[PDB]
Design an enzyme around this catalytic site. Sequence first.
Site, PDB file in Angstrom:
ATOM      1  CG  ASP A  25      -4.584   9.860  -0.322  1.00  0.00           C
ATOM      2  OD1 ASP A  25      -5.426   9.134   0.241  1.00  0.00           O
ATOM      3  OD2 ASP A  25      -3.396   9.504  -0.490  1.00  0.00           O
ATOM      4  CB  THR A  26       0.466  12.385  -3.296  1.00  0.00           C
ATOM      5  OG1 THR A  26       1.066  11.967  -2.062  1.00  0.00           O
ATOM      6  CG2 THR A  26       0.312  13.887  -3.271  1.00  0.00           C
ATOM      7  N   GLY A  27      -0.902   9.435  -2.574  1.00  0.00           N
ATOM      8  CA  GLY A  27      -0.878   7.974  -2.602  1.00  0.00           C
ATOM      9  C   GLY A  27      -2.020   7.320  -3.370  1.00  0.00           C
TER      10      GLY A  27
HETATM   11  C1  LIG Z   1      -6.624  -0.325  -8.190  1.00  0.00           C
HETATM   12  O1  LIG Z   1      -5.456   0.302  -7.665  1.00  0.00           O
HETATM   13  C2  LIG Z   1      -5.326   0.528  -6.236  1.00  0.00           C
HETATM   14  O2  LIG Z   1      -5.826  -0.254  -5.439  1.00  0.00           O
HETATM   15  N1  LIG Z   1      -4.652   1.584  -5.806  1.00  0.00           N
HETATM   16  C3  LIG Z   1      -4.530   1.833  -4.384  1.00  0.00           C
HETATM   17  C4  LIG Z   1      -5.287   3.108  -4.066  1.00  0.00           C
HETATM   18  O3  LIG Z   1      -5.140   4.078  -4.800  1.00  0.00           O
HETATM   19  N2  LIG Z   1      -6.040   3.057  -2.967  1.00  0.00           N
HETATM   20  C5  LIG Z   1      -6.801   4.196  -2.460  1.00  0.00           C
HETATM   21  C6  LIG Z   1      -7.070   3.944  -0.979  1.00  0.00           C
HETATM   22  C7  LIG Z   1      -6.613   5.063  -0.038  1.00  0.00           C
HETATM   23  C8  LIG Z   1      -5.110   5.136   0.108  1.00  0.00           C
HETATM   24  C9  LIG Z   1      -4.572   5.329   1.535  1.00  0.00           C
HETATM   25  C10 LIG Z   1      -3.925   6.707   1.630  1.00  0.00           C
HETATM   26  O4  LIG Z   1      -3.162   6.985   0.424  1.00  0.00           O
HETATM   27  N3  LIG Z   1      -5.571   5.042   2.575  1.00  0.00           N
HETATM   28  C11 LIG Z   1      -5.844   6.101   3.559  1.00  0.00           C
HETATM   29  C12 LIG Z   1      -7.003   6.990   3.138  1.00  0.00           C
HETATM   30  C13 LIG Z   1      -8.268   6.164   2.946  1.00  0.00           C
HETATM   31  C14 LIG Z   1      -7.254   8.013   4.238  1.00  0.00           C
HETATM   32  S1  LIG Z   1      -5.239   3.680   3.388  1.00  0.00           S
HETATM   33  O5  LIG Z   1      -4.705   2.680   2.511  1.00  0.00           O
HETATM   34  O6  LIG Z   1      -6.492   3.240   3.913  1.00  0.00           O
HETATM   35  C15 LIG Z   1      -4.208   3.947   4.608  1.00  0.00           C
HETATM   36  C16 LIG Z   1      -4.600   3.967   5.951  1.00  0.00           C
HETATM   37  C17 LIG Z   1      -3.674   4.212   6.977  1.00  0.00           C
HETATM   38  C18 LIG Z   1      -2.331   4.460   6.679  1.00  0.00           C
HETATM   39  C19 LIG Z   1      -1.249   4.740   7.733  1.00  0.00           C
HETATM   40  N4  LIG Z   1      -1.776   4.928   9.074  1.00  0.00           N
HETATM   41  C20 LIG Z   1      -1.943   4.430   5.348  1.00  0.00           C
HETATM   42  C21 LIG Z   1      -2.860   4.173   4.336  1.00  0.00           C
HETATM   43  C22 LIG Z   1      -3.051   2.081  -4.093  1.00  0.00           C
HETATM   44  C23 LIG Z   1      -2.799   2.325  -2.607  1.00  0.00           C
HETATM   45  C24 LIG Z   1      -2.325   3.562  -2.195  1.00  0.00           C
HETATM   46  C25 LIG Z   1      -2.017   3.790  -0.860  1.00  0.00           C
HETATM   47  C26 LIG Z   1      -2.204   2.779   0.068  1.00  0.00           C
HETATM   48  C27 LIG Z   1      -2.680   1.542  -0.333  1.00  0.00           C
HETATM   49  C28 LIG Z   1      -2.964   1.311  -1.669  1.00  0.00           C
HETATM   50  C29 LIG Z   1      -2.156   0.907  -4.490  1.00  0.00           C
HETATM   51  C30 LIG Z   1      -2.586  -0.416  -4.365  1.00  0.00           C
HETATM   52  C31 LIG Z   1      -1.736  -1.464  -4.688  1.00  0.00           C
HETATM   53  C32 LIG Z   1      -0.456  -1.185  -5.155  1.00  0.00           C
HETATM   54  C33 LIG Z   1      -0.022   0.133  -5.275  1.00  0.00           C
HETATM   55  C34 LIG Z   1      -0.863   1.179  -4.933  1.00  0.00           C
END
Ligand SMILES: COC(=O)N[C@H](C(=O)NCCCC[C@@H](CO)N(CC(C)C)S(=O)(=O)c1ccc(CN)cc1)C(c1ccccc1)c1ccccc1
EC number: 3.4.23.16
Lengths: 99, 99
Positions: A25-27
């Site tokens: 999960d690169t996000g």
């Molecule tokens: C303290 O710093 C943060 O909170 N960083 C956030 C972060 O790393 N969050 C981790 C949560 C999981 C991320 C994301 C997938 O990358 N999650 C899915 C995972 C649980 C299966 S998800 O956000 O739940 C999600 C669900 C569904 C979709 C599209 N159908 C897209 C995203 C990050 C982020 C990354 C992706 C999505 C949402 C948030 C972030 C937050 C705020 C600004 C920039 C990046």
Amino acid sequence: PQITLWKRPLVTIRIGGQLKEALLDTGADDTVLEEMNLPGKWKPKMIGGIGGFIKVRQYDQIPIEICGHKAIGTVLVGPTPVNIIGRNLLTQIGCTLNF
Amino acid sequence: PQITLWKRPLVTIRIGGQLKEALLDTGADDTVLEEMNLPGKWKPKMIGGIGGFIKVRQYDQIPIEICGHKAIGTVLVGPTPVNIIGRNLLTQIGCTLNF
Ligand SMILES: COC(=O)N[C@H](C(=O)NCCCC[C@@H](CO)N(CC(C)C)S(=O)(=O)c1ccc(CN)cc1)C(c1ccccc1)c1ccccc1
């Protein structure tokens, strides 16, 4: 290994003898694992997603094997349906995005 | 390009002649962008994630240029922490994970 994105990039991870499936999960900044006992001190943290925030337990210097690659670092444990492997560990195993 | 993960994989996208930054996210099935007006019909859609379930607007067959690479695909518009390029478009631009 090259992993395409036609399907969810799920791989095998091992942590302390528990074998689990995780999303690469690169996000995700951080690695967020489904509920599990890990050894050591943890502190509460809040991590944001598309719906808002969840509270997790942050554990530091945890060894996780990912596709045979040894990683050691921070693991957040909380109410996720899917183990997610974030950048903090993806970097350690030398994972890049390519196009 | 090859993109390492020591930093967030944020790239510039072009949509409707608007430049935005978005996150290349192998953990997302779908592409979700912050509030914006796109032309054409949309369908209300609800999507779930870490945090919970949000309402989005679904736009189909939308051209988007990602780091110079052209895609035409489904874009969800709604309240996201960050603009998210998901697998539906990542596959279009030939993106893979490698380690
Ligand atoms: C303290 O710093 C943060 O909170 N960083 C956030 C972060 O790393 N969050 C981790 C949560 C999981 C991320 C994301 C997938 O990358 N999650 C899915 C995972 C649980 C299966 S998800 O956000 O739940 C999600 C669900 C569904 C979709 C599209 N159908 C897209 C995203 C990050 C982020 C990354 C992706 C999505 C949402 C948030 C972030 C937050 C705020 C600004 C920039 C990046």
